[PDB]
């Protein structure tokens, strides 16, 4: 599978006039574009080499969309304030996430388009790309407005058509990085904790994409309940890191194995100290 996803954040600013609008777009775990309304001369900006090659017409049309979008979010934040009978003195946040998944066959699998207000679900396009789910009575006003305007058909046309074709173009033009998994580099460290206990920590570094599974087993039985996992985290160079740690009696280290599942690995990995 592969996906293209766009993430919009609009935040009102009492007194500072216009809200700040920020948009980022991803293919899988790779960001390729940024737009920020507070920038000196707002423009769509490349974040990956496989769109830097796109010409000025591409970037002019993306910029024009972002600029219109930011203008519409100002209106949206004002309407939402009316819907919830909220004051102008407070700051509020409107978020939108949308995009398309491509199947293992290269066909559209699933499209999405959903919104949140001050951190809670507001309205979502259903998987049929034809009807809406509203989270509350305010969002039901929006739903009726969008049913009347046939908003879902507008979004469906993008999600089923343009979204998929862009994703295919990007996957081809960036195939050297987007379609080549980078396997994790792995190793286990050892840190005494007491006279009879030691931490074993299994590391996975430099992997792409971010999806990974790290497990500790003792005697072939998962030690899930006593394993500390950190969230998968970005290395800063486009790859990711994760580790799992277990506290172990001094002497029983040889009883523990770390198991690593990642798509860049031909077979799952088993490691020990």
């Amino acid at each position: 599978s592969h996906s293209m996803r766009y993430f919009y954040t609009a935040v009102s600013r009492p007194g500072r006039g216009e809200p700040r609008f920020i948009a980022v777009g991803y293919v899988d775990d790779t960001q390729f574009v940024q737009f920020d309304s507070d920038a000196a001369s707002p423009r769509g900006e490349p974040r990956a080499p496989w769109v830097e090659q796109e010409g000025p017409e591409y970037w002019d049309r993306e910029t024009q969309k972002y600029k219109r979008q930011a203008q519409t979010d100002r209106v949206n934040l004002r309407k939402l304030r009316g819907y919830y009978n909220q004051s102008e003195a407070g700051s509020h946040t409107l978020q939108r996430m949308y995009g398309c998944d491509l199947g293992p066959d290269g066909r559209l699998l699933r499209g999405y388009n959903q919104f949140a207000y001050d951190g809670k679900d507001y309205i979502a396009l259903n998987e049929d790309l034809r009807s809406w789910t509203a989270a509350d009575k305010a969002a039901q006003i929006t739903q009726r407005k969008w049913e009347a305007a046939r908003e879902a058909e507008q979004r469906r046309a993008y999600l089923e058509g343009t979204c998929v074709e862009w994703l295919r173009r990007y996957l081809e033009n960036g195939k050297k990085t987007l379609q080549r998994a980078e396997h994790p580099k792995t190793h286990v460290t050892h840190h005494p904790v007491s006279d009879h206990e030691a931490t074993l920590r299994c590391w996975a570094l430099g992997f792409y994409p971010a999806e990974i599974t790290l497990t500790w087993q003792r005697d072939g039985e998962d030690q899930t309940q006593d394993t500390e996992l950190v969230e998968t985290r970005p290395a800063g160079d486009g790859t990711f890191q994760k580790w799992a740690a277990v506290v172990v009696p001094s002497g029983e280290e040889q009883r523990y194995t770390c198991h690593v599942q990642h798509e860049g690995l031909p077979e799952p990995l088993t490691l020990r100290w």
Partner: peptide, 9 residues
């Protein structure tokens, strides 16, 4: 490539 702009909320 981003979506165009649709109906206000």
């Amino acid at each position: 490539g981003a979506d165009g702009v649709g109906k206000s909320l």
